[PDB]
Amino acid sequence: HYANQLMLSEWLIDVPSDLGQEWIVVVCPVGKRALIVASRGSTSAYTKSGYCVNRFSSLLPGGNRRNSTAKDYTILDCIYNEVNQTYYVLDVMCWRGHPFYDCQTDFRFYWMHSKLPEEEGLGEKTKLNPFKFVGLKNFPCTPESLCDVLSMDFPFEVDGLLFYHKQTHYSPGSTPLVGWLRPYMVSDVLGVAVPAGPLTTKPD
Ligand SMILES: CN(C)c1nc2c(c(=O)[nH]1)N(C)CN2[C@@H]1O[C@H](COP(=O)(O)OP(=O)(O)OP(=O)(O)OC[C@H]2O[C@@H](n3cnc4c(=O)[nH]c(N)nc43)[C@H](O)[C@@H]2O)[C@@H](O)[C@H]1O
């Protein structure tokens, strides 16, 4: 079935000792989690719960009129952002038929840092690509980096931060090797200094 296909995070309560040297953080936009599947001709979006929420065309190698082939299917882990009609790419499980489930995440993240941009107008709205696909940036988890990101400006309403272990592979379901925290939470839970501002402002 198409359900339980996305790797899920857990609240990050315990702080990994090798955090700054073995983990990377991703700032996530507000939106809906989605399994994306481009296969022979078209692209389909599934919910975390497994059912299709859309079937359209995209500039992904998988489905599309112009660009298609056998086992040329591509599978992504995305967060759909309504206000921007954009599918923010979080992870890649399979590209052009090359599976990446058994690969460590820092490889997966780097592999999309360069292969997504290589697709002509993937980042723009177009007749064959009505929905934009934009890869999310990941950063180091050193104190300085965390401060950098927490003071950065994003083209979307930030929902939270995901913490990935560089070594873990891709396995569907919740896992401790992937952490989650609202931005205004890092100070307490991660015991570090942080730049005052929108992203670090706690709710009272
Ligand atoms: C709690 N947690 C560990 C967590 N929460 C997350 C994320 C995340 O990575 N981790 N996100 C990427 C986002 N998120 C929160 O869950 C919401 C999920 O909404 P969305 O996936 O876009 O719509 P959807 O139709 O899947 O919504 P669901 O019925 O699942 O209802 C939302 C609930 O799913 C659960 N959930 C979603 N993602 C995760 C997740 O990744 N881990 C865990 N443990 N739980 C999650 C939470 O209870 C969340 O409140 C987000 O809006 C945000 O409030």
Side-chain angles (χ1 to χ4, degrees):
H1 190 35
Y2 275 117
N4 307 180
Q5 296 291 157
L6 301 174
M7 178 172 260
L8 274 37
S9 63
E10 308 283 33
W11 285 95
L12 186 53
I13 295 73
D14 292 330
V15 310
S17 292
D18 57 359
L19 198 282
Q21 317 83 290
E22 220 57 57
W23 297 58
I24 50 195
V25 54
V26 181
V27 316
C28 301
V30 158
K32 294 293 181 180
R33 239 322 223 320
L35 196 216
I36 282 297
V37 176
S39 198
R40 55 189 191 164
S42 53
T43 323
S44 296
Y46 302 78
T47 57
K48 199 178 62 174
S49 67
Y51 47 102
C52 195
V53 52
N54 195 310
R55 178 170 275 77
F56 56 115
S57 173
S58 82
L59 290 178
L60 294 172
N64 194 322
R65 309 173 189 178
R66 321 291 190 66
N67 186 168
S68 177
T69 306
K71 190 185 177 182
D72 199 301
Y73 64 169
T74 307
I75 304 168
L76 276 17
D77 177 344
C78 316
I79 289 167
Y80 182 69
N81 178 286
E82 186 64 289
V83 312
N84 296 358
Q85 250 84 60
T86 298
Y87 273 102
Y88 284 104
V89 185
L90 220 208
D91 213 331
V92 51
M93 15 277 237
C94 182
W95 182 280
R96 296 166 192 152
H98 288 135
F100 291 166
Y101 293 83
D102 304 312
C103 302
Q104 39 183 169
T105 140
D106 72 318
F107 169 82
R108 284 185 269 106
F109 284 6
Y110 204 102
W111 205 84
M112 60 181 257
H113 171 249
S114 71
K115 286 302 183 183
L116 288 176
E118 282 178 50
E119 250 54 49
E120 63 174 64
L122 193 56
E124 49 186 58
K125 182 171 182 175
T126 248
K127 31 64 180 299
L128 272 176
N129 193 65
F131 299 103
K132 297 179 287 190
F133 277 81
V134 172
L136 289 162
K137 296 143 62 187
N138 72 73
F139 320 69
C141 288
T142 62
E144 309 88 323
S145 186
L146 260 31
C147 274
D148 298 347
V149 307
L150 283 160
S151 65
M152 287 184 58
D153 273 301
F154 302 82
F156 50 61
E157 182 197 315
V158 48
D159 178 17
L161 318 186
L162 281 174
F163 294 83
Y164 284 84
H165 180 109
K166 301 186 186 180
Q167 255 67 301
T168 181
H169 41 299
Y170 196 99
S171 64
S174 69
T175 166
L177 262 16
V178 186
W180 172 257
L181 288 182
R182 291 303 187 59
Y184 57 75
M185 286 183 199
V186 325
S187 282
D188 274 73
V189 46
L190 253 42
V192 297
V194 307
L199 283 158
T200 194
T201 299
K202 311 174 185 180
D204 202 306

